């Protein structure tokens, strides 16, 4: 109807770029490894990718893969909230789209107060929810070239699958050979590496999902499959060198349910470390501050007194007695419930 | 219904005919512009008005006579100091909602930098944000401290040195023109050094003899020119005027009685009446 | 913030009421008659706008400022212990 405000945003599917004629540089120019866009030697300047370092200082991270359909300011606030978990954030900037300044091109810069805070922040990628297009933001430290671990989630999923397979293998070995000593049983268990699934000695999934074999045995539901019995790393080895693993006699259905439960619990553990809360180890916030935080995402309902005027005269009697009395009764009920909550 | 943060709750689900036939004069009080979905005004886009802007309301009486009137926003002219822009910004038109939003954000610079476009509702604010980011990119231009509107346009951004040069050139032209006009209208006139004696009437009897003129300004031509320019700087008087920057300033309304020219029903200016008299807006 | 309910209309202008003229602020320095450092005080918006913020005695109580103060105090305590 009218010119669009920032509430109306549009974006379009990007066709993958194919150089159909490799020698035709005029119509199929090379992409730049820095900007990931077509080289334009006539009207562009070379970029080393470190330019923002001269602007934001050494303690700076570049964030990539930011989604569409969001204001640069909204994304700046969200990124500030996320990166506050690692220290004091001096600044957050989000580059606008070439064709829509209200949207982002997909790049941002975060300037930290402390080198240690920035280095801690760079370690893991940032997984976003569906409302942010499920994007996984990739982080790059400008002062050390350190990058985020974009394969962390899928490597951990593979580790969880390997742990379930290890549990099944050990249960089968116990069912076949009977009770076995720990240091001999553990050497019969193998995992498949990520991503090509090459057989390996099972020692990495255990330490990435549980921290140790004792943790694996003592954490549910594997303690419902196995029972450790007495006849640092040195303590672990010595303690395992004098044990026997005994099985809990289960049926096929119970064992299958237990394996599914173990998978689900490990999945929850994986999601927790990616969705750690942003208020962890921070002071409480006043009600006004919490309302200001909320307003970045949601607007409060408009006052009902203003809203009443929308009742059209064609079918409604504006300011009607029964309608207003209904409003008063609802208000009274809400106040009574609040009083009950207080008491 | 949905969109409970916006006006029209009981219109959202009544039908198409009612929506098209809605009569604006049904709404007595003004609705906030953001919740109504109203286009920002040019004045709002040239100032920082946040939630406030031109609106309308209806007058209804016991006789059931209806009347709709335009109502202007409550705007003040205030000066700000911006560290990000490295300059004082005189006479920005601001509102109470805008001032409260600046308080919430943490000041003028924070309000300009952090506010989303929908809430800011100010193209002038967006341009200020652009200039702040440009100054961040190019600190050396910030050290000049020129008025921020020098770099409002993108071309000035692409050619900063010409922007500063042209700004200074136009400023000097303005200064020279004003100086010449003031000299022309000055109350002190210095005649030529070869004929300083003006025509006089016969001195009244008993008046003491006037001493010979002291022409100290004839020793050097440079001194003569400096003295002549200094004399040209003089002014007859200085006038007082309404200025909101002064604590005791005020403006004027209409006459005490409240009457009007007999037999004349004056029509107020509109966009279809006296629309472009003496200036665009 | 302003409220849009029952505004005053006069002279063709609209003036909106301010039911809540108060805002919370964090005290960065000792202000005689207001509080000590690190306190969250409800002050008047004019007081914040024209005295406290210009003089650098307080700042709006945003989560950013609160967290920055907390982390700075923790760092200062750790610095004391390192010096000892």
């Amino acid at each position: 109807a009218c010119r669009p405000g920032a509430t109306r945003m549009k974006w379009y599917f990007q066709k993958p770029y194919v150089r159909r004629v490799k020698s035709d540089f005029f119509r199929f120019p090379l992409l730049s490894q820095v900007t990931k866009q077509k080289i334009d030697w006539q009207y562009h300047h070379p970029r080393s990718g470190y330019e923002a370092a001269c602007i934001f200082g050494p303690n700076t991270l570049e964030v990539t893969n930011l989604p569409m359909g969001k204001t640069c300011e909204y994304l700046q606030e969200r990124l500030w909230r996320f990166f506050g978990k690692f220290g004091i954030v001096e600044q957050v900037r989000v580059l606008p789209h070439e064709r829509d300044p209200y949207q982002t091109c997909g790049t941002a810069y975060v300037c930290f107060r402390s080198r240690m805070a920035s280095l801690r922040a760079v370690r893991l990628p940032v997984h976003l929810p569906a409302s942010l297009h499920n994007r996984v933001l990739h982080l790059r430290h400008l002062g050390t070239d350190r990058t985020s671990d974009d394969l962390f989630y899928f490597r951990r999923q593979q580790a969880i699958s390997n742990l379930v397979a290890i549990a099944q293998q050990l249960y089968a070995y116990l069912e076949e050979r009977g009770p076995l000593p720990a240091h001999r049983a553990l050497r019969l268990l193998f995992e498949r590496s990520y991503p090509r699934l090459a057989w390996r000695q099972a020692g990495f999934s255990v330490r990435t999902c549980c921290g140790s074999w004792l943790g694996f045995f003592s954490r549910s539901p594997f303690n419902e499959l196995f029972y450790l019995a007495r006849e640092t790393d040195r303590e672990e080895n010595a303690m395992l060198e004098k044990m026997v693993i005994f099985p809990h006699l289960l049926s096929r259905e119970k064992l299958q349910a237990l394996l599914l439960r173990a998978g689900r619990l490990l999945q929850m553990d994986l999601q927790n470390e990616l969705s750690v809360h942003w208020r962890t180890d921070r002071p409480p916030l006043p009600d006004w501050t919490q309302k200001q935080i909320q307003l970045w995402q949601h607007q409060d309902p408009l006052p009902e007194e203003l809203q009443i005027w929308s009742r059209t005269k064609d079918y409604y009697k504006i300011h009607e007695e029964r309608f207003l009395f209904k409003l008063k009764l609802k208000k009274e009920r809400a106040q009574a419930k609040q009083e009950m909550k207080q008491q | 219904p949905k969109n409970l943060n916006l006006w029209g709750k009981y219109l959202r689900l009544v039908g198409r005919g009612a929506r098209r036939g809605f009569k604006k004069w049904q709404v007595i009080p003004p609705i906030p512009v953001k919740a109504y979905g109203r286009e920002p005004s040019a004045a709002s886009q040239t100032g920082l008005y946040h939630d406030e802007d031109f609106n309308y309301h209806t007058k209804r009486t016991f006789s059931m006579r209806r009347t709709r009137r335009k109502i202007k926003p409550n705007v003040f002219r205030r000066t700000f100091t911006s560290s990000l822009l490295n300059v004082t910004i005189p006479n920005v038109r601001v509102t109470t909602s805008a001032l409260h939003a600046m308080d919430d954000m943490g000041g003028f610079d924070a309000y300009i930098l952090r506010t989303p476009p929908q809430e800011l509702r100010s193209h002038m604010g967006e341009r200020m944000r652009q200039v702040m980011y440009y100054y961040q990119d190019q600190p050396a231009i910030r050290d000049w401290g020129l008025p921020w509107k020098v770099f409002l346009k993108v071309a000035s951004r692409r050619d900063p040195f010409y922007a500063c040069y042209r700004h200074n050139l136009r400023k000097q032209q303005y200064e020279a023109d004003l100086r010449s006009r003031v000299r022309s209208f000055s109350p002190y006139y210095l005649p030529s050094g070869h004929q300083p004696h003006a025509e006089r009437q016969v001195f009244h009897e008993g008046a003491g003899e006037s001493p010979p003129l002291n022409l100290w300004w004839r020793e050097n031509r440079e001194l003569e020119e400096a003295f002549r320019r200094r004399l040209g700087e003089a002014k007859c008087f200085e006038r007082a005027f309404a200025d909101s920057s002064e604590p005791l300033g005020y403006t004027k309304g209409r006459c005490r009685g409240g009457g009007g020219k007999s037999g004349r029903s004056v029509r107020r200016r509109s966009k279809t009446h006296k629309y472009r008299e003496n200036r665009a807006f | 913030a302003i409220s849009h309910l029952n505004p005053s209309i006069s002279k063709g202008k609209v003036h909106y009421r301010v039911p809540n003229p108060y805002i919370p602020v964090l005290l960065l320095q000792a202000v005689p008659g207001l509080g000590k450092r690190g306190e969250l005080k409800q002050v008047r918006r004019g007081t914040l706008r024209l005295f406290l913020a210009p003089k650098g005695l307080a700042v709006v109580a945003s989560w950013q400022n609160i967290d920055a103060f907390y982390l700075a105090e923790k760092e200062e305590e750790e610095r004391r212990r390192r010096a000892q």
Partner: peptide, 28 residues
């Protein structure tokens, strides 16, 4: 309004100058 001062002297009994400082945390 023949005389229209920019600053109007504040009223003593207006609710604006007498409103309560409110509370930081509602729960306590």
């Amino acid at each position: 309004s023949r005389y229209q001062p920019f600053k109007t002297a504040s009223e003593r009994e207006s609710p604006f100058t007498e409103a309560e400082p409110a509370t930081n945390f509602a729960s306590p």
